[PDB]
Amino acid sequence: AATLQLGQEFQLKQINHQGEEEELIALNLSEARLVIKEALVERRRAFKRSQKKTREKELESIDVLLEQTTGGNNKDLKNTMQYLTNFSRFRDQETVGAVIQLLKSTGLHPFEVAQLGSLACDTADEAKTLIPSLNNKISDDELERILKELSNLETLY
Amino acid sequence: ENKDMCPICKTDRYLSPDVKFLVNPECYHRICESCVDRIFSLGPAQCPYKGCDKILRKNKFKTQIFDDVEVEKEVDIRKRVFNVFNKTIDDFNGDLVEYNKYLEEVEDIIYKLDHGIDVAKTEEKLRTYEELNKQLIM
Amino acid sequence: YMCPICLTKYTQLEAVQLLNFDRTEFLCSLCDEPLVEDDSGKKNKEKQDKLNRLMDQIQPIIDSLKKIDDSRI
Amino acid sequence: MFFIKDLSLNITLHPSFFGPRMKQYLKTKLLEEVEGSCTGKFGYILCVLDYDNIDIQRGRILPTDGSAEFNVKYRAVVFKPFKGEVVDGTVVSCSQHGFEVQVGPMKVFVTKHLMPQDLTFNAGSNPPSYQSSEDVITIKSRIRVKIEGCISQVSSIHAIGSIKEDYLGAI
Amino acid sequence: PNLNIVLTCPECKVYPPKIVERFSEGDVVCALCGLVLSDKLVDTRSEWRTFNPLLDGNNLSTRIGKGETTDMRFTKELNKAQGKNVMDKKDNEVQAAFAKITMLCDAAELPKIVKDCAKEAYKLCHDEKTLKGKSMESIMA
Numbered sequence: 001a002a003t004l005q006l007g008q009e010f011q012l013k014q015i016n017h018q019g020e021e022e023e024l025i026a027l028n029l030s031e032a033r034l035v036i037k038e039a040l041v042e043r044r045r046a047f048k049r050s051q052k053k054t055r056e057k058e059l060e061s062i063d064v065l066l067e068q069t070t071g072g073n074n075k076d077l078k079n080t081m082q083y084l085t086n087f088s089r090f091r092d093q094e095t096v097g098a099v100i101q102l103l104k105s106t107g108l109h110p111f112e113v114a115q116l117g118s119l120a121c122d123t124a125d126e127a128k129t130l131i132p133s134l135n136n137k138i139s140d141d142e143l144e145r146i147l148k149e150l151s152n153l154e155t156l157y
Numbered sequence: 158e159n160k161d162m163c164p165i166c167k168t169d170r171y172l173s174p175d176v177k178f179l180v181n182p183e184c185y186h187r188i189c190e191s192c193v194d195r196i197f198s199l200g201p202a203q204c205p206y207k208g209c210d211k212i213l214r215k216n217k218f219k220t221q222i223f224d225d226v227e228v229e230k231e232v233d234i235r236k237r238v239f240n241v242f243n244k245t246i247d248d249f250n251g252d253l254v255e256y257n258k259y260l261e262e263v264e265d266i267i268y269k270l271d272h273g274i275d276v277a278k279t280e281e282k283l284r285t286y287e288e289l290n291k292q293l294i295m
Numbered sequence: 296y297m298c299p300i301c302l303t304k305y306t307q308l309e310a311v312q313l314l315n316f317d318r319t320e321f322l323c324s325l326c327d328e329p330l331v332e333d334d335s336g337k338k339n340k341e342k343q344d345k346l347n348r349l350m351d352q353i354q355p356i357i358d359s360l361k362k363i364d365d366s367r368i
Numbered sequence: 369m370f371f372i373k374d375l376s377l378n379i380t381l382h383p384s385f386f387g388p389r390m391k392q393y394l395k396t397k398l399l400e401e402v403e404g405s406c407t408g409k410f411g412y413i414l415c416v417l418d419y420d421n422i423d424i425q426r427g428r429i430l431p432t433d434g435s436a437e438f439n440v441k442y443r444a445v446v447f448k449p450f451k452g453e454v455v456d457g458t459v460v461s462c463s464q465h466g467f468e469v470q471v472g473p474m475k476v477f478v479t480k481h482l483m484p485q486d487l488t489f490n491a492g493s494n495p496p497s498y499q500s501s502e503d504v505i506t507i508k509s510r511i512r513v514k515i516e517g518c519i520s521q522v523s524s525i526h527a528i529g530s531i532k533e534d535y536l537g538a539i
Numbered sequence: 540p541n542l543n544i545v546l547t548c549p550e551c552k553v554y555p556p557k558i559v560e561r562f563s564e565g566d567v568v569c570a571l572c573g574l575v576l577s578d579k580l581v582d583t584r585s586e587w588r589t590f591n592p593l594l595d596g597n598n599l600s601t602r603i604g605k606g607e608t609t610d611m612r613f614t615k616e617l618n619k620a621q622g623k624n625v626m627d628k629k630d631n632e633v634q635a636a637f638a639k640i641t642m643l644c645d646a647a648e649l650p651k652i653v654k655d656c657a658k659e660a661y662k663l664c665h666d667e668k669t670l671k672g673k674s675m676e677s678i679m680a
């Protein structure tokens with residue numbers, strides 16, 4: 001539920017594959033946009049490694065490129081992406097990493113800031129409307145100062 | 158009265174008559190809170206006050222608590238007329254006959270409004286209010 | 296909702312889980328046979344009249360009771 | 369929602385695939401049945417990272433079918449929905465009981481009993497779409513959607529949202 | 540919904556079921572095509588070899604008694620009580636007429652067959668306002 005009650009496989013307290021703890025890992029669909037294309041680009045040059053022995057057109061040009069590097073049955077993925085670019089308004093990766101620098105220097109729940117990273121909010125109650133869970137944990141002026149930062153941080157392409 | 162206070166609760170004087178029996182300025186009717194609220198909440202539907210079909214409006218009701226509705230109409234009519242004819246000359250220079258006669262004319266529409274004889278002069282009174290309202294705007 | 300064939304009750308949500316992209320209407324899990332809506336607010340109206348009827352019956356009773364309540368006799 | 373995660377898998381090798389490039393087939397079998405598939409316990413496995421450091425640690429032979437098997441401890445990404453959070457989406461399909469938001473890989477259909485009262489259906493629209501006091505919930509419309517019921521069965525999810533609260537609607 | 544199973548060949552689908560039954564090894568085989576369909580065919584015969592519902596119909600009860608590890612009190616309570624749950628059924632007037640004709644068909648030696656029919660018809664009507672009593676005897680006659 002919205003009430004920051006995600007399952008046990010989605011608690012904060014989760015283990016690495018090498019048996020060791022970590023805060024949960026949760027992105028906005030804009031940063032989570034970025035890692036896939038680069039990571040699947042790892043696969044594709046690597047697919048072509050062992051084989052050695054404005055934006056949206058950039059977007060789908062790759063979503064064919066990783067398509068043909070993948071098996072093809074995954075048109076749904078390039079749905080997920082095509083959903084993103086419409087609803088993923090972040091670019092210029094460091095900003096997003098620095099956006100998080102701001103969003104994490106709070107000690108907020110990543111689910112929230114990632115959800116904050118997922119949303120084109122403007123103001124306090126809006127943010128608290130869209131996410132109830134950001135209604136009271138903090139003082140909204142922080143949320144507010146962030147939002148105008150966030151609202152003009154918006155990289156419009 | 159004690160036998161007609163609502164379509165639902167017509168006998169309400171000894172049923173704790175603390176809930177409000179509103180006249181919609183267009184109902185002139187005894188509507189217990191249950192029905193009047195039920196109505197303006199859904200909206201301007203009729204208060205089913207004893208076969209009534211007149212629209213108990215949305216939240217535009219006024220307060221009239223059992224004031225002899227012949228008076229409630231006579232009171233509701235006079236104020237709007239005395240507001241439509243608000244100060245049409247009554248103290249322009251200090252006259253007592255004409256102002257009082259204009260006053261004697263003022264509530265004569267209200268007495269006609271509280272009566273509505275064969276209504277064709279009450280309509281003429283309404284045109285005077287539009288003329289009075291038109292004069293008020295200028 | 297319900298099903299009117301195997302007569303098991305249904306709803307919006309459990310069944311929209313069961314909607315299929317090739318279908319407009321919710322089939323049944325059990326009989327594989329589409330559903331129907333179910334409820335009726337009529338009973339609330341039926342209950343509204345009963346409270347209306349009971350208050351009419353109880354007014355002279357609560358007239359006398361309060362009238363008795365003056366001296367607690 | 370989008371989270372990133374560690375998942376273990378127990379995969380089985382029928383023995384004819386004991387050519388030494390099994391590992392690639394392990395890396396094959398892993399990839400070609402993890403991407404784009406689904407769980408009910410973590411949702412949509414969208415994609416997989418760290419293909420070069422793949423845990424293929426150890427393996428065992430089952431007393432029947434003789435088939436060796438392994439536990440491949442691997443990190444990927446997961447689409448995992450919950451209830452109550454707003455999320456945008458562009459609709460794709462309209463029917464009578466509401467409309468079908470293409471949310472990422474999911475198509476959340478919202479109910480007319482989840483639409484508020486201002487917005488109704490004009491079937492006379494083409495593409496059939498919803499005309500409100502202020503804006504139109506078309507198919508291509510980007511809508512701000514909160515989740516209400518998000519039914520996740522193992523290998524199968526479907527979800528329900530409504531705009532009936534504020535800063536919602538067509539965007 | 541009828542909750543049924545129609546048995547059918549998946550590799551023929553040719554026809555209503557034209558198969559054969561391999562009891563003695565427990566399978567049904569697609570007589571035409573040669574494929575088994577089902578397996579572990581349970582005994583359907585040795586089942587009964589061990590051991591009045593046309594009359595009594597659906598109700599269940601039992602004949603019971605005293606034990607070796609018992610005293611006459613528990614003998615007596617299950618003598619009186621197993622008379623206390625017979626009024627739940629008019630079937631005392633159902634059972635007893637049986638017991639009546641049971642006694643009687645015996646007394647004049649009648650075979651098993653006469654009795655059962657003469658039982659069976661007694662289930663058939665057993666009553667009507669038309670019959671309305673009628674002595675409870677001339678009917679049994």
Ligand SMILES: [Zn+2]
Nearest residue numbers: 163165166189
């Ligand atoms: Zn009333």
Ligand SMILES: [Zn+2]
Nearest residue numbers: 184185186204
């Ligand atoms: Zn009225």
Ligand SMILES: [Zn+2]
Nearest residue numbers: 298301323326
């Ligand atoms: Zn059914």
Ligand SMILES: [Zn+2]
Nearest residue numbers: 548551569572
């Ligand atoms: Zn066959």
